[PDB]
Amino acid sequence: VTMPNNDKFDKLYIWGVHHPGTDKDQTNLYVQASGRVIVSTKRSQQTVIPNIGSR
Amino acid sequence: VTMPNNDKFDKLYIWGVHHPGTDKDQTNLYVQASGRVIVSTKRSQQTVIPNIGSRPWVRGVSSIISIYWTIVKPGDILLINSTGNLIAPRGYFKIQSGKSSIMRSDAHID
Amino acid sequence: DIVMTQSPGTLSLSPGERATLSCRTSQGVSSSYLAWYQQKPGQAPRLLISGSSSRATGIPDRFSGSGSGRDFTLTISRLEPEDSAVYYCQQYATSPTFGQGTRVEIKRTVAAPSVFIFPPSDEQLKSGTASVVCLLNNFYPREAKVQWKVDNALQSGNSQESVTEQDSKDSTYSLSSTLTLSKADYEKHKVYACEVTHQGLSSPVTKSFNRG
Amino acid sequence: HQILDGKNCTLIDALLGDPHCDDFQNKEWDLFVERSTAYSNCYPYYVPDYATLRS
Numbered sequence A: 001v002t003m004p005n006n007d008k009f010d011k012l013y014i015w016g017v018h019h020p021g022t023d024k025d026q027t028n029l030y031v032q033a034s035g036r037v038i039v040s041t042k043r044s045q046q047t048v049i050p051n052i053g054s055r
Numbered sequence B: 001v002t003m004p005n006n007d008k009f010d011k012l013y014i015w016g017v018h019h020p021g022t023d024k025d026q027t028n029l030y031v032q033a034s035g036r037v038i039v040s041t042k043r044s045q046q047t048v049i050p051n052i053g054s055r056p057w058v059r060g061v062s063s064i065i066s067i068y069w070t071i072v073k074p075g076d077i078l079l080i081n082s083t084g085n086l087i088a089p090r091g092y093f094k095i096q097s098g099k100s101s102i103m104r105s106d107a108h109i110d
Numbered sequence C: 001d002i003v004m005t006q007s008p009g010t011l012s013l014s015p016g017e018r019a020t021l022s023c024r025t026s027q028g029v030s031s032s033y034l035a036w037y038q039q040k041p042g043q044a045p046r047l048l049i050s051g052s053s054s055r056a057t058g059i060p061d062r063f064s065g066s067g068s069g070r071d072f073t074l075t076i077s078r079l080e081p082e083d084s085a086v087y088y089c090q091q092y093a094t095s096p097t098f099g100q101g102t103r104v105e106i107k108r109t110v111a112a113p114s115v116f117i118f119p120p121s122d123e124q125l126k127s128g129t130a131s132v133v134c135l136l137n138n139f140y141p142r143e144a145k146v147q148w149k150v151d152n153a154l155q156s157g158n159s160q161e162s163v164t165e166q167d168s169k170d171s172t173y174s175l176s177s178t179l180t181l182s183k184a185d186y187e188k189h190k191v192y193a194c195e196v197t198h199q200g201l202s203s204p205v206t207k208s209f210n211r212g
Numbered sequence D: 001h002q003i004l005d006g007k008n009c010t011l012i013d014a015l016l017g018d019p020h021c022d023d024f025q026n027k028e029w030d031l032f033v034e035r036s037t038a039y040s041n042c043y044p045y046y047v048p049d050y051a052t053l054r055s
């Protein structure tokens, strides 16, 4: 998904990544196994790998 | 494993993660293939993925250990989930702050 | 703070015509967070449109919503005399803000005022006040001139008035003019007249009463 | 100067949208005041670069 900034000001996007306690929790909420989150702009780059484990 | 801080002071846990030179080295020491180390508290979060590959030769070894530290507050709990490659802590350093420092010098102490 | 600017301020169209209303926003607003309202004089706002083009329950299909970013539109395909109201846009992407409003007038075949005049009651006169009333009834357009004459002498600075809003069924207006004199001043004179000038009048109309 | 009493919310809880901080949605301040009494009451989270974000 993209979200273009066509306003006269800077936008601040707050987001996150969920890390499950177990592997069962992973697949129940997100069928697919631990995968990646990539949030990119023309200045930045933010890759996050989810790490499953008991917290 | 957890280790709860029920003392009146902060605990300093020094630990690390071992990164093998080869994949054979990985499975010999830790059956399982490269997996994760997760060291968590109620304030912090520390995930480490082991990365296997040939390192600089140091005294017989072409591998390396990454060193990490954690502070556990009173009422907080050290919690370690590890699937392998963990260089575990044996306990904690009592950590404080004060008229204490460090200096680099070759001056003779007299 | 998202500012909503509506265009035009006032819109006047006859029945059967299409009305187009515009809304300009200070920030880009997602089209899924914008609404349109109708407010008929004295009523609460009626939700017409939500989600920019989604029609609310109980709204006629002649009401159409459009737009994106900062440019939004309300279209009324087939005007009725019932559509005489103020229209508002609202954004709800942040804490709700609304426009200044667009006043829509429905046009009507020029109608002359049915003119009436009323003297002060004896009951009122007993208080020391003598208010005199003139009614211009069911006319179009709203523009109308009312002149008060006391013994054929134009008064001024004593005559207050108000006008009802356009009727939602027959699109006409009505006007109440009140000449307020004192009892004592009322009793110095005997002829009281109300002169009305209007578009539906080929010449001015005068109503009056005598005494005293 | 316009004071905003953070009360039982931290600036980051107010940001993220912790349920007991709904009163802070879309608010402004010349000075935001954090109280020691403040707490969190939502999903467990970690803000790497917390201090930077708060600032």
Ligand SMILES: *[C@@H]1O[C@H](CO)[C@@H](O[C@@H]2O[C@H](CO)[C@@H](O[C@H]3O[C@H](CO[C@H]4O[C@H](CO)[C@@H](O)[C@H](O)[C@@H]4O)[C@@H](O)[C@H](O[C@H]4O[C@H](CO)[C@@H](O)[C@H](O)[C@@H]4O[C@H]4O[C@H](CO)[C@@H](O)[C@H](O)[C@@H]4O)[C@@H]3O)[C@H](O)[C@H]2NC(C)=O)[C@H](O)[C@H]1NC(C)=O
Binding pocket: B022, B054, B056, B057, B062
């Ligand atoms: C990825 O890429 C790098 C670079 O190409 C490569 O790194 C190389 O790794 C190998 C093995 O891991 C290592 O091999 C020798 O390491 C010792 C150092 O050799 C150096 O010696 C000098 C320092 O003293 C130095 O100036 C030189 O320039 C030279 O580099 C060397 O002593 C070793 O030899 C002993 O060990 C082997 C077994 O491993 C025996 O077969 C030898 O006979 C010898 O053992 C003898 O001596 C010991 C005591 O020293 C004794 O206990 C024993 O019983 C016997 O008597 C190694 O031959 C290279 O040095 C290293 N190169 C660099 C530049 O770092 C990686 O291996 C690559 N990865 C893969 C998978 O290929």
Ligand SMILES: *[C@@H]1O[C@H](CO)[C@@H](O[C@@H]2O[C@H](CO)[C@@H](O[C@@H]3O[C@H](CO[C@H]4O[C@H](CO)[C@@H](O)[C@H](O)[C@@H]4O)[C@@H](O)[C@H](O[C@H]4O[C@H](CO)[C@@H](O)[C@H](O)[C@@H]4O)[C@@H]3O)[C@H](O)[C@H]2NC(C)=O)[C@H](O)[C@H]1NC(C)=O
Binding pocket: D007, D008
């Ligand atoms: C910010 O956070 C603080 C701390 O969490 C809140 O302070 C507490 O708020 C709760 C909810 O309003 C209060 O609960 C009320 O407690 C009264 C006393 O009961 C206990 O109170 C304290 C706290 O548990 C104990 O230490 C004490 O020993 C008592 O056992 C009750 O009388 C209240 O009962 C009724 O209150 C109203 C009706 O009046 C309704 O909510 C209910 O009908 C309820 O039955 C209630 O249980 C609590 O007392 C507060 N703490 C203290 C120390 O007073 C703040 O409210 C919160 N928000 C701010 C500050 O804006």
Ligand SMILES: *[C@@H]1O[C@H](CO)[C@@H](O[C@@H]2O[C@H](CO)[C@@H](O[C@@H]3O[C@H](CO)[C@@H](O)[C@H](O[C@H]4O[C@H](CO)[C@@H](O)[C@H](O)[C@@H]4O)[C@@H]3O)[C@H](O)[C@H]2NC(C)=O)[C@H](O)[C@H]1NC(C)=O
Binding pocket: A023, A052, A053, A054, B035, B036, B081, B082, B083, B084
């Ligand atoms: C974090 O800590 C928890 C503490 O319990 C730890 O949970 C353990 O996870 C392992 C890994 O999933 C569980 O072991 C599994 O149990 C059964 C039989 O042992 C099987 O489902 C698994 O075997 C797989 O192995 C095959 C070889 O590849 C696979 O191909 C196949 O899919 C099999 O399913 C596996 O052995 C273990 O049961 C739990 N422990 C408890 C008490 O439930 C968790 O692993 C830790 N996180 C880490 C290490 O990253």
